[PDB]
Amino acid sequence: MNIFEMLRIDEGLRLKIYKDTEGYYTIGIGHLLTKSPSLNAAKSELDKAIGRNTNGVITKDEAECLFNQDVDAAVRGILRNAKLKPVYDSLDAVRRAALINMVFQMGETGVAGFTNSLRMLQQKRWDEAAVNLAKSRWYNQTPNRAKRVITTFRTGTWDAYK
Ligand SMILES: *SCC1=CC(C)(C)N(O)C1(C)C
Ligand SMILES: [Cl-]
Ligand SMILES: [Cl-]
């Protein structure tokens, strides 16, 4: 198990434009296209991201291309952020993947707002962090995915994904 397989489980794979849990236009492996309600705006972003006239449908290779770019962007967003980098540096390899997962889903600014959870993770207070992480809109809106990520933070194992 690794971060690519983990996010592939959490995000799924769809080759046609769809709406995510929030109603935003998305494609591939959780690649957010736009938060605008216009399908034409989403098709325009898609063509721009892929470099061709797609008409809303991409191939599996194109979906994995965006996926690689998005995982790379998430990791580099963590390392550039003054609040996230110290937490990431303090974590073991499995818990680092859990932090990448969160950044992938809600963005670098959103995760950096979990000020109290991040401090508990840095102090390695795993049970207390898990309780604090669940007191969030994130947990209430996507509870099954949040539980898997929180369990990864709590245990340091991949057991939630087996
Ligand atoms: S993101 C790299 C990528 C993969 C593939 C689908 C082969 N592509 O057209 C590019 C080179 C963009
Ligand atoms: Cl992009
Ligand atoms: Cl869920």
Closest CA to ligand 1's atom 10: 65
- Counting ligands in written order, the one closest to the CA of 20 is 3
CA distances from 152 to 55, 60, 100, 155, 156 (A): 38, 28, 12, 5, 5
Cα R_g (the chain), whole angstroms: 16
Domain range for residue 90?
3-161
Please report the resolution in angstroms: 2.0
Pairing between β-strand 14-19 and β-strand 25-28 as defined by DSSP bridges: antiparallel
> What CATH number corresponds to the domain at position 53?
1.10.530.40
Establish whether residue 45 lines the binding site of ligand 1, counting it when its CB lies within 6 angstroms of any ligand atom.
no
- Counting ligands in written order, the one closest to the CA of 12 is 3
Classify residue 109 by burial, with Cβ atoms within 10 Å: 0-12, 13-18, 19+: exposed
Q: How many domains does the chain have?
A: 1
**Three-class SS state of 35:** coil
**Pocket probe mutation, ligand 1, options 50, 62, 67, max atoms within 8 Å of Cβ:** 62
